Amino acid sequence: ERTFSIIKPDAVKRNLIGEIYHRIEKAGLQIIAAKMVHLSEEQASGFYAEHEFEPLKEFMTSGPIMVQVLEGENAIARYRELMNSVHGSDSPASAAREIEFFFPESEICPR
Amino acid sequence: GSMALERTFSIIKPDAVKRNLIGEIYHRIEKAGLQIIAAKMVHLSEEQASGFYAEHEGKPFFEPLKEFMTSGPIMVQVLEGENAIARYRELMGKRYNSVHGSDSPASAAREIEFFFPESEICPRP
Amino acid sequence: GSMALERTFSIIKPDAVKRNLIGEIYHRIEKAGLQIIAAKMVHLSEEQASGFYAEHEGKPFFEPLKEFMTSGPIMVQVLEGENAIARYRELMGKRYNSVHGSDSPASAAREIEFFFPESEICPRP
Amino acid sequence: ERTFSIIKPDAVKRNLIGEIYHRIEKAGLQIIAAKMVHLSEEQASGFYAEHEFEPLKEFMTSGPIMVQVLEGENAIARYRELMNSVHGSDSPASAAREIEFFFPESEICPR
């Protein structure tokens, strides 16, 4: 069971990537895929297409973000209880749509 | 607007990724003034590890060095900041270390262009 | 002499104040029949932003919500008119919006008394 | 260099606050302090004490006004050329006396 995560530009700009990652790896999850992308207007619209909103697109494109896929025994529940400032999948099959939006299988690295 | 701005390359070897130390290493880098402007997790292969470490083909330790960097996923980043070459080198102290870092600007330029195209480097502003 | 008279509270968040959109937002409010009977520009603090949004202390998004409303000066106003609650809500469409507005009379009463005393409300006649 | 401004009760009553503010922010100035006050007989007399007149006090107290402080590179000249119906400082040190009459430093918000 794998979940999805997004580090908003507030934490990336304030240099908080290590704290967010360290608070997870100590909780049991494992970063099995990650990359830093700077979303565009069309990119942020596609991931947030279930709204159609405008002020949210401007903030998510105001700087680079840290996208990552997390693995672990029961992650959707463990992740949501760990943590706005950070994104996280609410239910399964919602993580599958968000993971496939940013990650092909060739970019996912099982341990 | 200092001209001491420079970027350095960094790799978190599979032993630290398998042990889940990615966050602990990132925190030590960020706490030293450096900033991650480009990063991704990749799993090297025989073909890719041979190209990066191609300067050590004739050495009798190539076949294992290639075999260590392909035993698990790694984490490669581009660290930016004032005197980032020396600052990041001082963080780890100075072949099979816990982390990788560039030792010179020409080495940093050649090693960044191997893993990251310019379209994957994200300026902070 | 309609009894549909009511007042609503409004905040222009620092992103719109820093971008110099105060006049553009005022014009859209005035062109919809509403009138500004009380207004002032303040710069919130950790202590003041915590009191206004005190209903969201346990939520994990409090610390940043407090940090956004204190990153720059804001503009707080009292808009008056017939059905001003729904008219102003319809202007913006319906947490981190371009502008703030009351959603109910009890919310408008509690939010006006936090920023404006009665001695700062100016009736139009 | 900051200047001073007063929106007379004619524009406030006619709902012209947005037009006056929009015509300024598009000109380069920035509203760094503002509040709506209803002047009294003693208030209007103090701000207009350099006369001592009577019909002017009655008009400036016949309704609420919009006081504001404006900031920008060379504002006294830029403001006077933008614009009776609206007040504005004529020279520097005349804005300092008018700003201090309505605004303590605790009410002025630099960006």
UniProtKB/Swiss-Prot annotation, chains A, D:
Protein name: Nucleoside diphosphate kinase
Subcellular location: Cytoplasm
Gene: ndk
EC numbers on record: 2.7.4.6
Keywords, sorted A to Z: ATP-binding, Cytoplasm, Kinase, Magnesium, Metal-binding, Nucleotide metabolism, Nucleotide-binding, Phosphoprotein, Transferase
Record GO terms (molecular function): ATP binding; metal ion binding; nucleoside diphosphate kinase activity
Gene3D superfamilies: Nucleoside diphosphate kinase-like domain
Subunit-structure text: Homotetramer.
Entry-linked CDD domains: NDPk_I (cd04413)
